[PDB]
Design a protein around this ligand. Structure first.
Ligand code: HEC
Ligand code: HEC
Ligand code: HEC
Ligand code: HEC
Ligand code: HEC
Ligand SMILES: [Cu+2]
Lengths: 471, 254, 190
């Protein structure tokens, strides 16, 4: 039997997705405030709040915990339905992935503030945690790929192409970037296998591809399932799906050196990164086109359905960032952009605008269904959430652009006499209003997250036994 | 539309958008062009281009502003402070250079703080002359009496009180007699008697007015106990600029 | 097609995804420029190595870059543009990604130890406008150096030239200052 879809894990992951979203974004707001007012840092005593330590916590919680859980819930729901079979690992393998993932985030929460970090971005957790994550991910791929193997229909939905790719590539990236000799039990009590330029390359190959697969590909899978899930029928382009998918999947791995522009990294590598990052523009947009064009005719729905609003706007930000990224990947542009708040602007445009928004919409869609509910408790709240999230994202982006341009310019600016026009401190001071506005925008987005939490909770209350009949 | 449905979802067989195609192809073409043009070429750079552009940037900058610096170098530091052409451009830019390099220790104002000298004022530890200031800048930059058996716990207190009297007048009679005696013995050698101080040593004058230095009895006790040990890092490696800066610092007082 | 075939799709994906990594990462292992240390350079001294770990633990990297780009203005501000050879020993590499604070690569003497202590103790005190967090605990905690030998041994395994003699021979604030003082020094003296 077991004809019914295993909703179990998806339910757990969805709720946790909301929870981690709140935790991660709140850390985001707090650290932002710390940039605005350093007092928020403990003056005497490292303690609980210190920016250097908290920052990676924000990073990991937001990406792996929030984004990660979103990916788990979405992939488990989506693959099951798209292929029409009950999850291959079942409660056992899949639930293991749930608890295991939960353990991973919990360990991050304890470990990071404690000070144990490799110092490698998006890599920060210590080796023991790395082994745990590798194990959980291995289990996750078996469940997912197994689900595909067990499918009913002969064809495999493109959404699964993206999810599947994301799964495999992240595993490879994680293993490779994490090679390190353990000196001690924890924290970064390991030293990376590589050093210098090589370490930088491995790091950014890993680092970009992280957003590339974890944040883009996997999420593209989400978009592929959820955007078309609507009352309106067909409008899409399958051939684009094919071109866009392969081209993206191939091209994206080359993008690593754009991080490294005008650094110690050899010129040839930097160039390869730039060129491929520019080629990357097309496939990435292919995703957005495929998503948006699908809406055509359907647009009237946008006023009606806020979940749709979220998905659509999500693609808008996605395209924007996928455009801005290639531009910043040009050496001349990077010359200005690098080390400035602009990089952050770019990150949150994609993070809040693309990743968060699509996952949000995804959840609003799925959680009622998984919960054995016709719909969310209040649509109005989804709308309010939509607005809060949108203004917050835009405010964040605007502030960062102003700050970033100001910083790059101020840093580079030379006088008539040839001397440096501004002290670094002057640039720092210039940045303050930007820091505050950013703090506010992020705060608003966070509030939207709270509204989501309230709404979801209300809906969650309704029924025990929410097997949703056959499905 | 295509024949197979994936739970609700069906997909149209549609063509790639022409513009999308064009942009994709264009990017590819640009990439090939870039690679041929970059490392694998472009004209303008002999050999092969690289980060080598750095040399060009510096070189053109040098051509453009070499004259200003070169003119200044011939001139003496004192002259480079006076003259608003070099001399004034030396204060604003020297002042420009000052903010970037010096401000973090000596204050944006150049007024200084505890542990760092006030460059604006009249008082100079190493000497106010142009040569001295220049030397301070170019080549960069107090004995622990607590230990020297004789000084001890009490001797230090006494010397501190006495120095505060040289600087002004507090009231502690034991802390004065003893201190006078000790100062004449030891301190006076570097700080002189009546604390004129010796510029050669960088020993500051004890007969000073209220400055940023820890005038308090306790602070004086600590410096006497443990001694000083302050550094002015050399700008000869890091820094022409040193010269303009000397001209600026000199201009600062007057 | 290959739409239908799970194994084929998986294999092609793994293959497609691999090319960039093989093309970019692998050749670097081989290239000498990125491998060769500056001639003068030696590995971090045990105090400096410990301090570097502290710099890592604290999260200094999150605000401070250690990579000078080859532009005139940054050369002017920071010093000589960073060279691959400088980072040869760095497991893991410290190059920044963000400059909330200024670039640290070449503070090969720029400030006194005393300044560093005061500043780390309270950045606002020395630099009123600073965003930097206060790190007074550094003064509070002492180093046991139990682990230092293990750390150097591991680094040697990784290729760092520590002598047996170096291992045998080997406050947190002291270590951090020691680390900061070495940065970028290797190039200038050599
Ligand atoms: C922190 C590391 C400093 C740097 C950066 C700069 N200065 Fe400095 N300077 C510093 C100290 C602690 C002292 C006092 C040293 C002592 O005798 O205890 C000084 C001294 C000077 C002087 C001499 C002043 C005098 O009384 O003769 C000069 C002229 C001076 N400093 C200039 C100067 C310039 C131009 C700088 C930027 C290039 C600069 N200093 C940086 C501490 C520090
Ligand atoms: C020989 C060298 C001496 C000796 C024998 C004494 N002093 Fe000190 N002193 C000396 C120098 C070069 C400096 C400057 C230190 C620095 O700038 O880092 C000082 C400084 C002081 C100060 C501090 C002045 C200030 O607050 O800025 C004091 C209070 C002082 N010296 C006192 C002092 C006393 C009481 C001595 C006899 C016990 C004494 N000095 C001896 C150089 C030298
Ligand atoms: C984020 C906020 C940080 C944190 C995590 C660190 N620093 Fe910094 N730092 C920051 C700013 C905005 C500034 C400029 C204002 C100031 O000088 O206080 C700095 C400065 C430094 C400097 C001086 C650099 C220079 O002027 O050449 C150093 C040496 C420095 N910071 C060191 C340092 C260390 C060791 C850190 C981890 C404990 C650290 N910083 C963290 C902002 C931030
Ligand atoms: C991926 C999802 C994601 C979400 C959602 C997110 N962030 Fe971040 N955040 C990141 C990443 C990635 C970085 C690291 C950027 C870098 O290393 O350049 C970061 C870094 C930051 C920083 C450090 C900035 C700096 O200059 O060092 C702040 C502040 C911040 N985020 C605030 C926020 C706020 C406020 C929110 C409010 C919702 C938020 N974040 C939500 C991903 C996210
Ligand atoms: C989350 C959504 C997201 C999307 C979508 C995205 N990136 Fe980014 N981008 C990031 C993050 C996170 C960083 C910061 C990495 C770091 O910490 O240095 C970044 C930084 C960058 C930088 C600046 C690196 C530096 O330090 O100067 C470039 C260039 C870049 N990305 C290119 C791209 C390209 C090319 C694409 C797609 C074609 C893209 N981005 C899409 C998240 C994203
Ligand atoms: Cu990237």
């Amino acid at each position: 039997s077991k004809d019914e879809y295993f909703d179990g894990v998806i339910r757990a992951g969805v709720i946790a997705t909301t929870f981690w979203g709140i935790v991660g974004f709140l850390v985001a707001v707090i650290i932002a405030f710390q940039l605005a007012f350093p007092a928020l840092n403990l003056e005497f005593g490292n303690g609980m709040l210190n920016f250097g330590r908290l920052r990676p916590l924000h990073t990991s919680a937001v990406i792996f915990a929030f984004g990660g859980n979103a990916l788990i819930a979405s992939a488990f729901y989506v693959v099951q339905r798209t292929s029409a079979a009950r999850l291959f690992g079942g409660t056992a393998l899949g639930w293991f992935v749930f608890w295991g993932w939960q353990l991973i985030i919990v360990t991050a929460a304890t470990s990071y503030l404690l000070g144990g970090s490799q110092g490698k971005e998006y890599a920060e957790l210590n080796w023991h945690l790395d082994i745990l994550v590798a194990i959980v991910w291995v289990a996750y791929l078996i469940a997912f790929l197994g689900t595909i193997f067990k499918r009913k229909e002969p064809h495999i939905y493109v959404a699964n192409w993206f999810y599947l790719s994301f799964i495999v590539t992240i595993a490879m990236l994680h293993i490779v970037n994490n090679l390190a000799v353990p000196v001690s039990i924890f924290g970064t009590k390991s030293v990376q296998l590589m050093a210098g330029v090589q370490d930088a390359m491995t790091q950014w190959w890993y680092g970009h591809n992280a957003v590339g697969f974890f944040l883009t590909a996997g999420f593209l899978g989400m978009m592929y399932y959820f955007v078309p899930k609507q009352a309106e029928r067909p409008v899409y382009s399958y051939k684009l799906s094919i071109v866009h998918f392969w081209a993206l999947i191939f091209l994206y791995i080359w993008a690593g050196p754009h991080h490294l522009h005008y650094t110690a990294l050899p010129d040839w590598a930097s160039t390869l990164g730039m060129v491929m990052s520019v080629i990357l523009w097309m496939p990435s947009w292919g995703g957005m086109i495929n998503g948006l064009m699908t809406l055509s005719g359907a647009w009237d729905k946008l006023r009606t359905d806020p979940v749709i609003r979220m998905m659509v706007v999500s693609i808008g930000f996605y395209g924007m960032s996928t455009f801005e990224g290639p531009m910043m990947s040009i050496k001349a542009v990077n010359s200005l952009s690098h080390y400035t708040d602009w990089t952050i602007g770019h990150v949150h445009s994609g993070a809040l605008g693309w990743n968060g928004m699509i996952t949000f919409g995804m959840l609003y869609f799925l959680t009622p269904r998984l919960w054995g509910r016709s719909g969310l408790y209040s649509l109005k709240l989804v709308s309010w959430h939509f607005w809060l999230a949108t203004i917050g994202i835009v405010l964040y982006a605007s502030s960062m652009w102003v700050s970033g341009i100001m910083e790059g310019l101020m840093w580079r600016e030379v006088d008539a006499q040839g001397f440096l026009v501004n002290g670094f401190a002057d640039t720092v001071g210039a940045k303050f209003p930007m820091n505050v506005v950013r703090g506010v925008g992020g705060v608003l987005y966070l509030t939207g997250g709270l509204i989501m939490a309230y709404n979801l909770w209300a809906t969650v209350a309704k029924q025990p036994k929410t097997a949703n009949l056959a499905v | 539309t295509t024949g197979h449905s994936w739970d609700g979802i069906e997909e149209l067989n549609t063509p790639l958008p022409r513009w999308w195609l064009w942009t994709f192809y264009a990017t590819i073409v640009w990439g090939v062009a870039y690679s041929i043009a970059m490392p694998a070429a472009t004209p303008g750079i002999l050999g092969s281009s690289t980060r080598a552009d750095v040399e060009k940037d510096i070189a053109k900058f040098a051509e453009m502003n070499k004259a200003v610096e070169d003119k200044l170098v011939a001139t003496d530091l004192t002259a480079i402070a006076a003259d608003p052409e070099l001399v004034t451009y030396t204060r604003n830019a020297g002042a420009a250079v000052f903010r970037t390099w010096c401000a973090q220790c000596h204050g944006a104002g150049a007024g200084g703080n505890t542990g760092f000298p006030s460059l604006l004022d009249g008082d100079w530890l190493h000497g106010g002359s142009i040569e001295t200031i220049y030397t301070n800048i170019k080549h960069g930059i107090m004995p622990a009496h607590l230990t020297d058996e004789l000084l001890e716990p009490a001797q230090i207190d006494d010397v501190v009180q006495y120095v505060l009297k040289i600087s002004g007048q507090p009231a502690d009679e034991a802390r004065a007699t003893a201190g006078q005696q000790v100062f004449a013995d030891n301190c006076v050698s570097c700080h002189g008697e009546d604390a004129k101080g010796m510029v050669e040593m960088g020993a500051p004058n004890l007969t000073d007015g209220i400055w940023l230095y820890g005038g308090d009895a306790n602070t004086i006790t600590t410096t006497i106990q443990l001694g000083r040990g302050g550094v002015m890092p050399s700008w000869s490696w890091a820094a022409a600029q040193i010269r303009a800066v000397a001209s600026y610092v000199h201009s600062l007082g007057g | 097609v290959l739409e239908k075939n799970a194994t084929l799709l998986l294999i092609f994906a793994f293959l497609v995804v691999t090319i960039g990594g093989i093309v970019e990462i692998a050749p670097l292992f081989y290239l000498e420029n990125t491998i060769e240390k500056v001639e003068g350079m030696r590995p971090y001294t045990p105090l400096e190595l410990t301090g570097r770990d502290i710099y890592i633990r604290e999260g200094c990297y999150v605000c401070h870059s250690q990579m000078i780009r080859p532009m005139r203005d940054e050369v002017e501000r920071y010093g000589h543009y960073s060279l691959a050879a400088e980072s040869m020993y760095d497991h893991p590499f410290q190059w920044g990604s963000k400059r909330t604070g200024p670039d640290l690569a070449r503070v090969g003497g720029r400030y006194s130890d005393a300044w560093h202590v005061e500043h780390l103790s309270n950045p606002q005190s020395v630099v009123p406008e600073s965003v930097m967090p206060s790190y007074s605990y550094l003064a509070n905690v002492p180093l046991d150096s139990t682990w230092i030998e293990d750390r150097v041994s591991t680094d040697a395994l990784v290729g760092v030239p520590y002598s047996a003699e170096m291992i045998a021979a080997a406050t947190e604030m002291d270590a951090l200052v020691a680390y900061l003082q070495v940065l970028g020094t290797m190039v200038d003296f050599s």
